[PDB]
Amino acid sequence: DAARSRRSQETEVLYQLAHTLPFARGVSAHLDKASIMRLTISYLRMHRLCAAGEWGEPLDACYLKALEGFVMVLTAEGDMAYLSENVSKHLGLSQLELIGHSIFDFIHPCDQEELQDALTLEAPTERHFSLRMKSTLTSRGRTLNLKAATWKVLHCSGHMRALQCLVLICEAIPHPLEPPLGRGAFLSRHSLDMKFTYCDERIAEVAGYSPDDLIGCSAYEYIHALDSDAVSRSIHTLLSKGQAVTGQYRFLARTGGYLWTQTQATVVSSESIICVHFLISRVEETGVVLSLEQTEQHT
Amino acid sequence: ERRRRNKMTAYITELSDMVPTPDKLTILRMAVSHMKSLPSFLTDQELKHLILEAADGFLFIVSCETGRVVYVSDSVTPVLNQPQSEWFGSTLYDQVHPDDVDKLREQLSTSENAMGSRRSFICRMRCGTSSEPHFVVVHCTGYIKAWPQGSKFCLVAIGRLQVTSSPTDMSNICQPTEFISRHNIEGIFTFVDHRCVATVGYQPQELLGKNIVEFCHPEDQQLLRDSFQQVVKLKGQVLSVMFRFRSKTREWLWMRTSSFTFQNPYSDEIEYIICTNTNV
């Protein structure tokens, strides 16, 4: 009867500790003891990490509001040290269920090697990589229980900082319309070999192409050779993960020159690719012919 | 459930090492009072610093109607090499590339999308310049907020550099040493960059449509052919060859061409051969 008494008081002080957690009132009523322990331990670890920073304002809350992705800091062992609340908006899983667990239990298997090489033309500590994370979201909300969770491609960018942490902002690649359209972008559709099957009419204003002439042509013929490798890698990602974001690259205009571009590509359903290209520049070197088609059109 | 009791042991030991100031429930008691020694998981200030540790960016707030800068954070100085002197008192259009003004104005329009609506765009902004301004690509994400005339709408945004990998000649800072070309499998020039003009004396259009063999010394032509056939039978691995190239003027030049086939990432068909042609 003394063993019980002690265990009952253990559960009581553990529930009191759950009441000390930095969450709204009543949330602790939905937690189990293991989750209480995990969240308290991770809270103390994150406080130790934030205390090591060498530095109250009402404009602070703007920062997470201005971001589109979510905050994630991972330890050197791969455990999710911290996630911001808006993670629920991107993966369905909340920070309550994810803080204190290992990232590898929520990453696609074939991405674990990439992440492991990230946790150990680019500044030495800066990190850019795509990661498939478990998400329970559909267009109707959080409708998937964890075992039918789908893979969501996240463009992760951040820094190795110093224990050593990897601090990332992780952003979702939106899935791709009707006039009137905006400026600084156009849309294209390709087969999996990246041959044009459709292209926005705005291309005529952007690069001077009529969309009908692009139909059937390989997209790789329209990139600057200097951007060869990078675009290749992007497409490889697009082919293995389902979505990708390219770097800045030069797209060749019809009669000469090029313009700076960055595109988001998504595989859709037998399968095809949709590209949303955001323009960075207007046509540069307009009087310079670079490709054979460019000099065939300059005449 | 033997696992369940054993993870709870480990946890109590982790919290043991976490609380600075025993038996498990004594651990829990002192951890309760320690937690009460210190509602969100992190403070807004902490999260701000975390975000600034992740992104190379700065927060700005500008009026939607005129672009007038109403706030910029001090991290604009390390990011853009720009004093806050340059932003406060100006408009965002003063900072961006002229070619971006229209786009900016459209992003700042709240006609169809207003309070709480999101914005995401790319522009080029002025950085610190010693002697003609120099622009850098900035990715901006933010939201529309009524700013307390009446309460005018404002864009509250973060602008970041280096969201992806950055996108040449690097051994001679003055005159180009090489140029890149592309060829069909037949060897015809289908792409050349303008450095050709400085390296071999030809305008790009003087090479496009012609075969690379047409510029190779006859005594070296068979060697060049062999090397190209070999690179076609390899799949992406680079192979080098050295041969005498005929200049538009100024005689024969020793030239190192290192080539590899571009494989379609899906169909694995040859898109073209890529060549780096370097004057030896």
- Show residues of chain B in contact with A194, CB under 8 Å: 264-266
Do B20 and B54 fall within a single domain? Answer: no
The total number of structural domains in chain B stands at 3
Give the residue numbers spanning the domain of B273. 178-279
Do B137 and B153 fall within a single domain? Answer: yes
User: Span A1-53: which CATH code?
Assistant: 4.10.280
Sorted by where each begins, the domain ranges of chain A are 1-53, 60-172, 185-298
Question: Is position B169 within any domain?
Answer: no
Q: Which fold has domain A60-172?
A: Beta-Lactamase (3.30.450)
Do B240 and B143 fall within a single domain? Answer: no
- Cα of A78 to nearest chain B Cα, Å: 17
Question: Is position B173 within any domain?
Answer: no
Do B143 and B50 fall within a single domain? Answer: yes
* A99–B265 C-beta distance less than 8 A: no
* A67–B164 C-beta distance less than 8 A: no
SS3 B36: helix
Question: Is position B215 within any domain?
Answer: yes
Q: Which of B161, B192, B218 is the last residue of a domain?
A: B161
Do B32 and B59 fall within a single domain? Answer: no
Q: Other C-beta atoms within 10 Å of B84: how many?
A: 13
* B137–A41 C-beta distance less than 8 A: no
Q: One fold for both A1-53 and A60-172?
A: no
CA-nearest residue to A239 within chain B is B266
Question: Is position B26 within any domain?
Answer: yes
- Show residues of chain A in contact with B38, CB under 8 Å: 47
The CATH number of the domain where B193 resides is what? Answer: 3.30.450.20
Q: What resolution in Å is listed for this PDB structure? A: 2.3
Cα-Cα-Cα-Cα torsion B10, B11, B14, B20, nearest 10 degrees, comes to: -130
Q: Which member of B31, B59, B267 has the closest CB to residue A62?
A: B59
Question: Is position B167 within any domain?
Answer: no
Do B48 and B157 fall within a single domain? Answer: yes
Do B152 and B231 fall within a single domain? Answer: no
Measured CA to CA, the distance from residue B115 to residue A167 in angstroms comes to 30
Question: Is position B171 within any domain?
Answer: no
User: Span A185-298: which CATH code?
Assistant: 3.30.450.20
Do B7 and B97 fall within a single domain? Answer: no
In a mutational test of the A interface, the residue from B164, B270, B277 whose CB has the highest number of chain A CBs within 10 Å is B164
